[PDB]
Ligand binder design. Structure first.
Ligand SMILES: CCCCCCCCCCCCCCCCCC(=O)OC[C@H](COP(=O)([O-])OCC(O)COP(=O)([O-])OC[C@@H](COC(=O)CCCCCCCCCCCCCCCCC)OC(=O)CCCCCCCCCCCCCCCCC)OC(=O)CCCCCCCCCCCCCCCCC
Ligand SMILES: CCCCCCCCCCCCCCCCC[C@@H](O)O[C@H](CO[C@H](O)CCCCCCCCCCCCCCC)COP(=O)(O)OCC[N+](C)(C)C
Lengths: 175, 122
């Protein structure tokens, strides 16, 4: 349904075959499905219609909270406590958002594996590639910080990685 | 070592220099004063209990005098304590202002230019 965006959680076009009866015998599954429909799906639908009718008479909205962007930990003086506090809060929010991004990608991967059935090893290559990329990025950013993590430790990790990459690049240039 | 024993202009047994009158007095609802009154009330209760009298009801005049005396002493005690701390801060700031070489304000460095070692936890 329209509850979620179908671009963030995509699905294939859902091709299903038409029934081709080849026996004179009746199909018990169809008879049981008709019984289940008429006996379960209709009263539930009526109850849902009543509940939605009651809901439409009382409609109110809640809004997603917006946050502005503040200076990062790089634009803060060494002992400036207030700027450090704002930067740390913003960094923590970004960490939560990145965790949720990884969660979305993992949900895509699991849904693909279940959906594709016996052809999952070939039909889910793109989702596996996306998860590998996002996992590599996330791992670089936050792994090994440990408990008592902060924006300063993440910055130190990034600086160390940049220094190593610069040295490797300059030594490969001399080759 | 005595830090304030011989500070120029100090009167030997004053307990409250005239300079202290320039500071805001403690409010009568100061929680420290309330704690001193609590101490006086506890002293009154212990006085009742030691003398084998009904602890809460025995002497109301005595308990009132206890609370009043503790509050009365505590008010002047707090005034003197606040005066001493104001003196300490005044002297500190004057000395820092008069010796600029010993208290330099060096250049501020942002965290984007300071190299901090990263220690992985694994
Ligand atoms: C941290 C936050 C704040 C906490 C503050 C600190 C703690 C509280 C304050 C401490 C001092 C205050 C009390 C001092 C006098 C107490 C002496 C005493 O004997 O009491 C008996 C006395 C009973 O005597 P009685 O009623 O005349 O008749 C019974 C006979 O006397 C029958 O008596 P008896 O002599 O025949 O019975 C014998 C008994 C008699 O022996 C005792 O009663 C022991 C009392 C020793 C007093 C404590 C020592 C000095 C204070 C130091 C406390 C240190 C606290 C820090 C933590 C360390 C813990 C020790 O001895 C034993 O049975 C041996 C038992 C061995 C146990 C050993 C443990 C003893 C030490 C425990 C101290 C804990 C703190 C005080 C406990 C409360 C005591 C009432 O108790 C009371 O009735 C008075 C207590 C209530 C008064 C306060 C109520 C205020 C009014 C109500 C309205 C509130 C206003 C709210 C405002 C908002 C508007 C609504
Ligand atoms: C266990 C609790 C301790 C309680 C101790 C006794 C408390 C009751 C005693 C009442 C004190 C009365 C003295 C005040 C009357 C006027 C005298 C005044 O002029 O004396 C001044 C001095 O003031 C007194 O010293 C202040 C006494 C207050 C003591 C209380 C502080 C206790 C520490 C915190 C514990 C909480 C106490 C709570 C009390 C209920 C003179 O200053 P100065 O001549 O230049 O100093 C000589 C010493 N020097 C030079 C070497 C420094």
């Amino acid at each position: 349904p329209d509850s979620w965006d179908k671009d963030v959680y995509p699905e294939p076009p859902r091709r299903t075959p038409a029934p081709a009866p080849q026996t004179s015998l009746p199909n018990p599954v169809t008879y049981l499905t008709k019984i289940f429909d008429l006996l379960v799906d209709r009263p539930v639908t009526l109850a849902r219609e009543f509940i939605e009718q009651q809901h439409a008479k009382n409609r109110y909205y809640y809004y997603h909270r917006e946050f502005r962007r503040v200076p990062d930990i790089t634009e803060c003086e060494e002992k400036d406590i207030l700027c450090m506090f704002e930067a740390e809060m913003q960094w923590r929010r970004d960490y939560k958002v990145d965790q949720e991004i990884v969660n979305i990608i993992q949900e895509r991967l699991k849904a693909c594996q279940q959906r594709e059935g016996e052809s999952y090893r070939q039909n889910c290559a793109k989702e596996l590639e996306q998860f590998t990329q996002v996992s590599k990025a996330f791992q670089d950013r936050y792994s090994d910080l440990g408990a008592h993590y902060s924006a300063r430790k993440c910055l130190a990790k990034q600086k160390q990685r940049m220094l190593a990459e610069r040295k490797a690049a300059k030594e490969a240039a001399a080759a | 070592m005595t830090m304030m024993s011989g500070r120029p202009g100090r009167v030997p047994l004053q307990f409250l220099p005239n300079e202290a009158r320039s500071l805001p007095p403690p409010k009568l609802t100061d929680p420290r004063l309330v704690y001193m009154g609590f101490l006086g009330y506890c002293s009154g209760l212990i006085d009742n209990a030691i003398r084998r009298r009904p602890v809460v009801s025995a002497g109301l005049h005595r308990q009132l005098l206890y609370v009043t005396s503790f509050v009365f002493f505590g008010y002047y005690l707090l005034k003197r304590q606040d005066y001493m701390y104001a003196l300490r801060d005044h002297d500190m700031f004057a000395y820092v202002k008069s010796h600029p070489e010993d208290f330099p304000e060096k250049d501020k460095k942002t965290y984007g230019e300071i190299l901090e070692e990263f220690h992985p936890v694994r």
